[model samples]
Target chain A: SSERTFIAVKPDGVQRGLVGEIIARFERKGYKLVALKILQPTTEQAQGHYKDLCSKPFFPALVKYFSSGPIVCMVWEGKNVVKSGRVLLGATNPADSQPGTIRGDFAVDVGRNVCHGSDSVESAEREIAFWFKADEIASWTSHSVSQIYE
Target chain B: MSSERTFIAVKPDGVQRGLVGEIIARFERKGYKLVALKILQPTTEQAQGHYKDLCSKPFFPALVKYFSSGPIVCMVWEGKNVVKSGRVLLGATNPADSQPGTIRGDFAVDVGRNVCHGSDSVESAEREIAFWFKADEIASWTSHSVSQIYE
Candidate 1:
C-alpha cells in the first residue's frame, strides 16, 4: 500500500547544510516528495508540532532547538514510507545508529541528530497537516519507479 | 582540514529514476560543494578509460553497455575529507552488502544495478576529476553556511 510520511531536516541539519542530503536520500529511495519548504517555526508552531511531548521536561528545549534556525520540512509519499524513512534516519543517537543510516553516517551527537521522519502513519498524517497546506502538496511518479518497488 | 575534490556519477539506472537532484543534494548536505556537473552519454572510448582497471573482468562488457545505455550525471564535489566521505555516503558497491542508510543500501538491491560510483582513493579522485571535467568546468564557490558547517 502507498503511504505518506512527514520528514524534516532539523535546525542543526539545516544550519550544518544537510537539507539537500536528507531530501536526496528519500528521492533515491524512490519516494515522491509531495511538499517541501524551508522556514523557522514559531514557538507556538513548534509547541503545536511537538504537542505529544508537552508533558516531558525536555519539551521546552526541543521547542527552542527547533525554533533556532530554518528547518526543511517535507512530505514524502511511497509504499512503506513511514517505516523505511525511520530506517533511513537511523537511531536517534548517532552513536548507536548504523553506519549506513543518515544519522549514523553524518551526525555525531544525540543533541544534533541530523533529521526527523515521522514514527507512524498516524503521526505522519498529523505532521504533514501541521506543516503544509493542501495546495502545497503535489502528486507525481518517477519514470523508472518499477525498479524501486515490487 | 583543507578541502579536496572527488568525482562521482549517477549511473544509467539512477538517472532513469530521476535521481540527479537527489544525488547532488546528498553531496551538498554532506558539506560538500559541487564544483562541476553535466549529463552526457559516455562514448565507448570514454567509458573504457573510466573503467579501465575493470576491463579484464568478465562483466566488463555489460558494465560498459549499461553505463552507456543512458545519460549519466557526472559531478565533482569538494570538501574536507571528501574522497573518503564520498565513498561512505555511496556505501559499498554491492547494495546487498551496503548498510541501510548509505545511498546504495537505501536505493539499490543488486551489485549490477548500484546507482552511483565514487572515486576509490585520493589519487583516483584527482584522476577521475580530471578525466571527466575540464579545468574551466570546475567552478569556484562557497556555501552560505560554511562557518556553521565547518565550525
Candidate 2:
C-alpha cells in the first residue's frame, strides 16, 4: 500500500473558514504537506474527476457543488496516510463520524459535508492524477528546494 | 508601537520525539511564521549573551548548559500583539500550573525545562536579536503571509 495520499478540503469547508483547523489536524498528525493550493476547478474537470460515480443519483448535484468554490488541495505523506487521512477527516457521513475526528467534530450533515474522497488506494491514484500531472506529484516527492512547498 | 519579538526554542525533548509540528501549530495559530531557524549548538559566547540577564541568577548556569547541550530550534516572528499572544500560546513556564490549552500545559513539564520563552517587550527584542542573529542572518521576507486569509 502507498505511504501517502492526496487529500482535498472541499469548497464548503474553505468557504466556512476551516482551512486552518483542517491543516492543523494534518500537521499535528505528522503528515508531510507537499502540494497545497487553492483550486477552483472547472465544471468539466470536476465532472470527469469523479466519473466513476457519475452514474449515481447524487453525481449531478455533487459535481455542481464541488466545482462551485475555491478548495484547498494537498498531497500528504506518512505511514498509511490514505487511511490516516480518512481517520482525520472522519466518516463519509458526518452523522457517522466521531467527535475527535474532523467530520465528527466540525461537520454533521451529508449534503453539506465538510470534505471529500478516496474510498481506496486505486481511487486515490486516479483522483490525484486527474487533478495533477505526474510531474506535479514527482516534484513534491523528489524536487530539491521542495521544502519551500511545506 | 514597534513590533514585539521573542526568542523561543522547542528544546531537546520537543525535538527528539518530533513535537516540532505541534509546537509550530500553536505559534502559527497565535499568528507567527518561520522567519529564521538554525539547527546547531549555540557557542558559549552566544549562549551567555542570549541569557545574559539571568547570568547572575541561580538558574543561570543550568539554563546555559541545557540549551547548549543539543540542537534547539530558534525563530523570530513578529506581529502587533505578538508578545502577549506568544506567551498565551506558550502557557505558564511551569507545566504543572499551566492551563490545558497552552503549549507548556499540553507538552511540557517543569519550569527549568519549559519548552519555550518570549521577549517581554521591544527592549528585550533588541537584546535578543543581537544575541541570536547576526545583523544580516535574519531574512527580510515579504509580509504577504496573512494576505491570503486576512483580506
Candidate 3:
C-alpha cells in the first residue's frame, strides 16, 4: 500500500543530457533515491522489459528503439510516489503533457516522451525488479527526527 | 584477499540529516566498488542482532531502540585495504575525538548519535555484511576504473 516507484530516463533523455535534471527534479521534490544505474539495454533485454506490450504490433519497434542507447534507471521512495510520479513524468504523449513537466518540457511524441514512470504500485514493482535487483533498491523511512521510541 | 570488503552505514541521525548520498560518494571517489547499498529501517530483531555483543551493557536496550528509531543507509564497499582505510574516512567513533575534514568531525556531534559506523576489523566486516545482506544481494561487477586503480 506504500513505498516507492520506478523511473527510467529513456534513451532520448540520456542522449540529451537530462539525466541529472530528471534526478534533480525528484530530489528537489524531496523524493529519496534508493536505487540507480545506467544500463545499455540489449535488444532482448529491451524486449523483456516491455513484455506487457509484446503482443502489440508496435512492440518490436518500441523495444528496438529502447535498445538504441543507455537508460538511467532509478527508484524513488516516498508516500504516493507511484501516482504522483506519473504526474511528474507527465502524459505519455509529450504534446498532451503540460509545460514544466518532465516530458512536457523535454520532448515530444509518445515514443520519445523523455521518461517512463510506474502507472500503478503493482506495475511499479514489476518494472523495478526488471531493472534493479532486490539489494539494489533501498528501503527506509523518513523522519524529522524522533524520540521516546514513541 | 583482493576484494577487501568493508561495511559502512549512515546511522539514523546521519540519514535523518540527509547525509546518505554524500557519505556514499566518498567511498566511490576513493575508488571503492559499491557491492551493495540500500536505505533500510532496521527492525527490532535486526537492531538486537546488530548490537548483540552489547547485550551485557546496561544501556543496550536504549542503544538498540535509538538505532531502530528510523531509516539508515546500509552499504558494502569493496577495495584494497578498504576495511582499514574506510575507518580512516569515517574518522573516530566519538565525534569529539574526530579531527577536521572527517565525516564524524564535520557533520556529527553527539557520541550516542554519531552519524555513521564502519567495521573495526576484517572479521567484523564479514560478520556484519553477512547479517545485513544476502549473497545474491552483493553485486560482483567491476567498475570501469578498477583496472586503472588496481593494476
Candidates 1 and 3 compared: the better one by TM-score is 3
- Candidate 1: lDDT over CA atoms? 0.84
Per-residue CA lDDT of model 1 for B1-151, tens digit only, reads: 4378889999999999887787787666555778898999999888889999998999999998888888999999887667777887888899988986678988999888999999999999999998999999989987785644443
Tell how far residue A10 is off in model 1, in angstroms. 11
On DockQ, the leading prediction is: 3
Candidate 2's clash total is 0
TM-score of each: 0.57, 0.49, 0.66
Model 3 agreement with the true structure over B33-143: per-residue lDDT tens digits? 666666677889999999998889998999899999877767788889999989999999989999878889888888898899999999999999999988866766546
DockQ of each: 0.15, 0.03, 0.17
lDDT of 1 at B40: 99
Clashing pairs in 3: A139-B39
Q: Which of the two, 1 or 3, has more lDDT?
A: 1
Q: Give the per-residue lDDT digits (tens) of candidate 1, residues A29-144.
A: 88988899999999999999888889989899889877888989999988999999999998886546665678766764566777888999999999998999999999777786
What is the C-alpha RMSD, rounded to one decimal, of candidate 1?
9.8
Model 2 steric clash pairs: none
Per-residue lDDT of model 2, residues A6-95, tens digit only: 778887678767888988888877667766778898889889877878888978877887788888877777667788888788778754
Q: Rank the candidates by TM-score, best first.
A: 3, 1, 2
Please report the candidate that would top lDDT against the real structure. Answer: 1
**Could you give the CAPRI-style class of model 2?**
incorrect
